[PDB]
Amino acid sequence: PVKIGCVLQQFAACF
Amino acid sequence: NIQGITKPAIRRLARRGGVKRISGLIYEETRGVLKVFLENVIRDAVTYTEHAKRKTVTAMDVVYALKRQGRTL
Amino acid sequence: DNIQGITKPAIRRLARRGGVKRISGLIYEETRGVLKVFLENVIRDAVTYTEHAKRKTVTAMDVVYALKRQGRTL
Amino acid sequence: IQGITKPAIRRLARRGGVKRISGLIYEETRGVLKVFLENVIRDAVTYTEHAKRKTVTAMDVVYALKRQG
Amino acid sequence: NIQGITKPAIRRLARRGGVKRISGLIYEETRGVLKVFLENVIRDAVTYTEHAKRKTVTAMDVVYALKRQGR
Amino acid sequence: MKVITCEIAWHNKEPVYSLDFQHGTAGRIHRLASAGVDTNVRIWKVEIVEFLSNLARHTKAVNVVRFSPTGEILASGGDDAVILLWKVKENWTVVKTLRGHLEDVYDICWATDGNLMASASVDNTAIIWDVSKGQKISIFNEHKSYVQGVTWDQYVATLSCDRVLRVYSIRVAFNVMFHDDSMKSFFRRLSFTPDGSLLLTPAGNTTYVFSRKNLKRPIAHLPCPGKATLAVRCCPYRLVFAVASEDSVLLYDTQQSFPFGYVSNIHYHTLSDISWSSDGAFLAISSTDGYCSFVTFEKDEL
Amino acid sequence: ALREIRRYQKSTELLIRKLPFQRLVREIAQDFKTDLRFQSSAVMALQEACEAYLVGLFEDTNLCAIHAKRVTIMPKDIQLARRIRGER
Amino acid sequence: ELLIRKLPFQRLVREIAQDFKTDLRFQSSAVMALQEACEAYLVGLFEDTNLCAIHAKRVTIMPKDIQLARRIRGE
Amino acid sequence: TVALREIRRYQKSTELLIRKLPFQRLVREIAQDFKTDLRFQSSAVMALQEACEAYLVGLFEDTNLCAIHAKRVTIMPKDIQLARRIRGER
Amino acid sequence: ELLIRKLPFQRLVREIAQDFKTDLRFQSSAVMALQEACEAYLVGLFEDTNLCAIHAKRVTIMPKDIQLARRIRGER
DNA sequence: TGGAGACTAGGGAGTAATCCCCTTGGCGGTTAAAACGCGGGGGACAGCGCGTACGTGCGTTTAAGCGGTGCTAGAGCTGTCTACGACCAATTGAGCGG
DNA sequence: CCGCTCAATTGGTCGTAGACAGCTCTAGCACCGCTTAAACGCACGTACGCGCTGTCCCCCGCGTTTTAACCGCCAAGGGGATTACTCCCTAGTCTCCAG
């Protein structure tokens, strides 16, 4: 399992 | 009501189906299967009509319901 | 030319649903003609059944009996 | 087709819930089995020619069941 | 049995049919197709004969069966 | 955030089709609704999963399972083209059968007041029925392809496989981007904001966010490289929502543009649905491989 | 009786009467929801398909009865033929 | 005018009758009726399969042609 | 591959292939052609169009069988003539 | 578990496929799925014919029951 | 490369199919009528389709293009319609017996 | 028509020999149906005034079919005797699955 805590830039938002 | 399906109606229908002698309570029983078949074909026909956004059922929706049943005729 | 209103890709898709792969370019007029012939052959029976019922319009049931005479009830 | 052995059919029947079994049923269901594979594989090869391959797949038998029901 | 409709009979029937040339496997698949055409027509004829209570099979039953078939 | 993989098959290795969490419950113990390919609806209690009730009313496989906001009426959508309204180790009794779909039902939406039901099916039409009368009251058949997403806000949003998004006033109002039927998922459930201001549309890969002012052009789109998003779920100011990809689960926030958390490489098949609980502290996540897994998190931003 | 099977098997006309089958269809539509227009063409189609269903079911139940060495046909054959077809 | 010979078909129809039901009755008129019917059907089948063959740049007729003709006829 | 794709799309599907009002107008032409002042109910037009659809699909499958027996993949109106004649139509 | 042994099933499907066309290999998954479906069809028809036999108040199956079941199902 | 579950052959008999014999019910004419079914005439209120204006766009249409294909010429093997001598079932000629 | 013989000869058929007409295979050629690009254009939906085509239920006209009580009689059925056929090992074997 892979889990990232409640802090991804590779999954940024592109407007 | 369902008694509209007359005793001689079942008589002659089964006779065309090819029965030499008919039992006595099969008349009262087959109105049940008539009920079941109606409450399926008409049930799906009215939904087909509503899907067509019309309030008048037509023979085409009916034969489509038969197609879904698989007894097209 | 409204008989040719049945488009070339329309005939192509129709034939394909029957499972075809390659269609000759000159078959299109032929299938238009055979479609017209079949349509006449079934509309005639529909018309006679409407007239016998003394009907001034044709409904969906009549063509069903027309196909019943033809032999392709559906 | 004789490869469908007698007690294979017999415990198929025991699963079916039967108690007493006849003799002619063996090759009778052999024949009906033959017809079942003929139309199932008929539909399968109809979809294989449509698929332009030589090996059948699980999708082919799935479609065979869908068309037979 | 089925072999009674022999090879030369089918040969002359084909000659009357207008086909010039004939193979071998035809001589028995024609027997198979003829037995197929026969079993259903005899079946239906027996239905109408029992249906009219006739042990003997009249020609009217035959033409009725043919009309049902379409020939 | 803790991820626990359940090693037990929920319905004897049947594929995963739908989930529904009891919104009516306001405590820590959560109730799970599980209807799948087993042609039966199984009710389980999650706090650890314990099976509570099993209902085999559906004649065929059930694709969508949902409950009313009050949590007392459960609507189950199956392949029999019938939606059964369920009422109150547990006993479940069907109250109404919300028929009216010509094909298999894919997505089911409820109403906040609970007096209306919104259904989506493969018949390329939208079925809206009144819970009080139990009969269809409005139909939107503008879909030219399979309809796999519908939600209720003033407006009703409908998404179909024809790569077109339809918004209808409770007639169609706006038409809006998507891909073809190449997606291996059977659910494209769009999600509206809890306040209804924003609408989320997956399977666009990117997921677009539209606002109440203008839904024709989305200001921002959250990309989904690799796997495509299938379902969107929002926890029931700032709001936290979740979008499920084919094999990845990401949780986004109202403020942070980037995903708050990312979870992937948990199941070996395509994901089926995304759904949170009433309290938001229980969210079991799985795919269509026939198994289940659980994701748990605290720090509830009350 | 066999003469009578002949006189209807030769024929094609309806066997259920027009008006009470029409009324049965109307009341069946009533209990689903009111305000429905049934074009007489659709009622004709219902009568045709319903008579076809019953003649087919009666042929199959006749097969079942003659299987049981009984010329008469009983309800038992009716439900068994319904089930074997897969209806129930 | 008949081409199939009489008593072979007489025995054939009698034997299929017996394989169906024993002790069956068949008049001569019925056997001639069956004879003309089967002759017409088989002559038509051969004529049409000959058309099928001559389509395929082929003079002879082999079994693929006959099964094609039957399958097109739908029986 | 395009053919195989659209076959997978279509053989499961059952929607229309000839468009609605082109067929409807063709029905109008033939109706007024043989005897004028007839009204066609749109449900009847849909019915007749479905019957036409099925007839053409069946005939095209039969001429495909003919072509396969003829050892070629492309159809030819000779195949159409053979199918019509073998079926007893024309 | 299944109640029909394999390589008779693979050899029979091989031979029939051969009589239709040459060189159509199969993979184990397809033959196993088709064997599963075939066994299901046989067991369903067998339960059906069992019910038909008990209809005639005789517990023993007979082969006429088989084609009766097939023809009521409209198989042929 | 080997051997344990299992298919085949068969004795054993014991249960189950099959056939006949009342036997009692209950289903098929049928008669008198009646009564609900078939027909046919209205009113226009209220429903459906026909036709039209406009959109808009998803479809058709043209084409340039090239490559899968139809076929056409050329063998290579092959089974089959020539002739014939053999069987060979067998139609006609007659019946008894029904 | 059966159903079966008792013969005559008598056309009808069966297997043989094979030459070659033709099925089948190979191959090349040209050619002519598949393919985006772009134009267009008419499907196609949406509304909407206008019209007429299911239609209505009432009565009544009648009248054919349906109800039903009666009654003879045909089979549904329950039982018992009789003959056939899978169980239950016993053993060979075989062979499919395993190491």
Residue whose C-alpha is closest to residue G39's, from G22, G24, G57? G22
The distance (Å) linking the CA of F28 with the C1' of L13 is 96
Token pair for B44:
């799906």
Strands B21-22 and G37-38: unpaired
The answer to whether F233 and F247 are in contact (CB under 8 A) is: no
F270: left (phi over 0), alpha (psi -120 to 50) or beta: beta
The answer to whether C66 and C45 are in contact (CB under 8 A) is: yes
Subset of residues 10-49 in chain C with CB less than 7 angstroms from any atom in strand L:
12, 21-26
The answer to whether F76 and F65 are in contact (CB under 8 A) is: yes
Give the phi and the psi of residue C27 in degrees, each rounded to 5. -75, -15
Instruction: Give buried/exposed letters for G8-19 (b at 16+ CB in 10 A, else e).
Output: bbeeeeebbeee
DSSP letter string, C35-63? HHHHHHHHHHHHHHHHHHTT-SEE-HHHH
Chains J and H touch, contact meaning at least 3 pairs of CB atoms under 8 angstroms apart? no
The answer to whether E48 and E64 are in contact (CB under 8 A) is: yes
F42-45: list long-range contacts, CB under 8 Å, 24+ apart. Answer: F42/F10, F42/F11, F43/F90, F43/F92, F44/F10
Three-class DSSP labels, chain I: CHHHHHHHHHHHCCCCCCCHHHHHHHHHHHHHHHCCCCEECHHHHHHHHHHHHHHHHHHHHHHHHHHHHCCCCECCHHHHHHHHHHCCCC
Q: Can you tell me which residue has its alpha carbon closest to the C1' of nucleotide K58?
A: F144
Helices in E2-58 by DSSP H: which ranges? 7-17, 26-51
Asked whether the CA dihedral C45, C51, C56, C62 is positive or negative, the reply is: negative
Chains A and D touch, contact meaning at least 3 pairs of CB atoms under 8 angstroms apart? no
CATH of the domain spanning J1-76: 1.10.20.10
The answer to whether F113 and F132 are in contact (CB under 8 A) is: no
Q: How many residues does chain E have?
A: 71
Residue whose C-alpha is closest to residue E46's, from E62, E67, E31, E66? E62
The answer to whether C46 and C66 are in contact (CB under 8 A) is: yes
Place of tokens 């924003």: F198
**CA distance between the termini of chain A:** 31
Question: Residue J25 CB: number of other CB atoms within 10 A?
Answer: 10
- Neighbouring-strand partners of residue F45: F31, F50
Q: What 3-state class would DSSP assign to C74?
A: coil
Residue whose C-alpha is closest to residue F237's, from F277, F298, F194, F203? F194
Can you tell me the distance from the alpha carbon of H2 to that of H69, in angstroms, rounded to the nearest whole number?
24
Residue whose C-alpha is closest to residue F92's, from F124, F128, F53, F119? F53
Amino acid letter at G16?
A: I
Architecture of domain C1-74: Orthogonal Bundle (1.10)
DSSP letter string, chain F? -EEEEE-S-TTSSPPP-EEEE-SS--SS-EEEEEE-TTSSEEEEEE--EEEEEEE---SS-EEEEEE-TTSS-EEEEETTS-EEEEE-----EEEEE----SS-EEEEEE-SSSSEEEEEETTS-EEEEETTTTEEEEEE---SS-EEEEEE--EEEEEETTS-EEEEE--EEEE-----TT---S----EE-TTSSEEEE----EEEEEESS-SSS-SEEEE--SSPP-EEEE-----EEEEE-SSEEEEEESS-SS-SEEEESS-SS-B------SSSSEE---BTTS-EEEEE------
Closest residue of I to C32, CA-based? Answer: I56
G80 inside 8 A of chain B by CB = no
The answer to whether E21 and H60 are in contact (CB under 8 A) is: yes
The answer to whether F244 and F273 are in contact (CB under 8 A) is: yes
Chain I residue numbers touching D52 (CB-CB < 8 A): 4
Chain B residue numbers touching C61 (CB-CB < 8 A): 59
Within 8 A by CB and 6+ apart from F254, the residues are F237, F238, F239, F240
Domain encompassing residue F247:
2-296
CATH 3.30.1490.70 fits H1-75, yes or no: no
Q: Which CATH number fits domain D1-69: 3.40.30.160, 1.20.1050.40, 1.20.120.1200, 1.10.20.10?
A: 1.10.20.10
H36 inside 8 A of chain E by CB = no
G5-88 belongs to which homologous superfamily?
Histone, subunit A (1.10.20.10)
Can you tell me the distance from the alpha carbon of F33 to that of H2, in angstroms, rounded to the nearest whole number?
77
Are B47 and F99 inside 8 Å of each other by CB?
yes
Considering its fold, how many domains does chain F have in total? Answer: 1
Alpha-carbon separation of residue D54 from D44, D59, I1, J24 (angstroms): 11, 14, 16, 5
B44 to chain I nearest CA, in Å?
Answer: 17
Question: Residue E35 CB: number of other CB atoms within 10 A?
Answer: 14
Can you tell me the distance from the alpha carbon of G24 to that of G27, in angstroms, rounded to the nearest whole number?
5
The distance (Å) linking the CA of H1 with the C1' of K83 is 28
* Strand L lies under 7 A from the Cβ of residue I74: yes
Amino acid letter at H17?
A: A
Q: Which residue of H62, H67, H72, H73 is the best one to mutate when testing the E interface, meaning the one whose CB has the most E CBs within 10 A?
A: H62
Can you tell me the distance from the alpha carbon of F33 to that of F48, in angstroms, rounded to the nearest whole number?
15
Instruction: State the DSSP code for C19.
Output: -
Can you tell me the distance from the alpha carbon of B35 to that of F288, in angstroms, rounded to the nearest whole number?
40
Closest residue of H to I77, CA-based? Answer: H55
G6 inside 8 A of chain E by CB = yes
Indicate the resolution in Å: 3.8
The distance (Å) linking the CA of H57 with the C1' of L11 is 38
Can you tell me the distance from the alpha carbon of J66 to that of F302, in angstroms, rounded to the nearest whole number?
68
User: What DSSP element (H or E) covers J41?
Assistant: helix J28-55
The answer to whether I24 and C27 are in contact (CB under 8 A) is: no
- Which technique was used to obtain these atomic coordinates? cryo-EM
Closest residue of B to G49, CA-based? Answer: B73
Contact positions of strand L to protein Cβ (< 7 A)? 1-3, 12-14, 21-24, 32-35, 42-47, 53-55, 65-67, 75-77, 85-87, 96-97
Can you tell me the distance from the alpha carbon of D31 to that of D28, in angstroms, rounded to the nearest whole number?
5
Closest residue of B to G52, CA-based? Answer: B73
Are G45 and C59 inside 8 Å of each other by CB?
no
User: What DSSP element (H or E) covers H29?
Assistant: helix H28-55
Question: Residue F13 CB: number of other CB atoms within 10 A?
Answer: 11
Which CATH number does the domain housing residue F64 bear? 2.130.10.10
G14 to chain B nearest CA, in Å?
Answer: 9
Instruction: State the DSSP code for B22.
Output: E
The answer to whether B35 and G82 are in contact (CB under 8 A) is: no
Can you tell me the distance from the alpha carbon of C72 to that of C49, in angstroms, rounded to the nearest whole number?
17
Can you tell me the distance from the alpha carbon of F190 to that of F230, in angstroms, rounded to the nearest whole number?
9
I7-90 belongs to which homologous superfamily?
Histone, subunit A (1.10.20.10)
Chain C residue numbers touching G39 (CB-CB < 8 A): 59
Token pair for F82:
């019938």
| Fold of the E1-71 domain | Histone, subunit A (1.10.20)
Place of tokens 């072999």: E3
B1-73 belongs to which homologous superfamily?
Histone, subunit A (1.10.20.10)
Place of tokens 């059930």: F62
Strands F49-55 and F261-264: unpaired
CA–centroid distance for F21 within its chain? 10
Asked whether the CA dihedral J39, J40, J41, J47 is positive or negative, the reply is: positive
Instruction: State the DSSP code for A2.
Output: E
The answer to whether I26 and I45 are in contact (CB under 8 A) is: no
Amino acid letter at E59?
A: A
Can you tell me the distance from the alpha carbon of I66 to that of I75, in angstroms, rounded to the nearest whole number?
9
